[PDB]
Symmetry: C2
Amino acid sequence: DMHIYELVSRDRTHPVRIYLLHSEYWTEDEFYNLLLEAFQRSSASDWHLQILEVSKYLVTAHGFVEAGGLQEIGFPGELSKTEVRRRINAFLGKDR
Amino acid sequence: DMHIYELVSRDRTHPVRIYLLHSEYWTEDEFYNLLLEAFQRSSASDWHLQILEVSKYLVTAHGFVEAGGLQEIGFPGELSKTEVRRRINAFLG
């Protein structure tokens, strides 16, 4: 039962999202503490670059594996199966 | 490599997020088609129940694996390594 750890570099037009996987659960505090650890062997760059370094350290030092990305599909819970199917068909066009 | 597929059921009080992992990459369209595929087998329920049926179908029929959840930390891209450290500490204490 794997767990997902995301690191975000916030930006107006060029945000960075890194999704890491681990087989174990890390509490939020443990998670933050991991970044402090990374902060010791990495350069003093700004976050948009530092995020890359922290990711590299979690992977090498603690067994996180980087995922290729995340795709999402959402609907209101109240939405009938017919309207869901409606919305999906409209989205798919001829790729059905 | 490994890819994440998240199904969301939006609600006023009990939103539900389900995170699925797969070894293989599926386009959004293919992911949508997977839902239609599951719809062939599933009940006539509203989405808040349907989502659970779709998840189970993706898992048992398509080799998707459910993840336990998702945790996230974010900072402004422009933020210095110095201030990042300070926020982390502020949060921890």
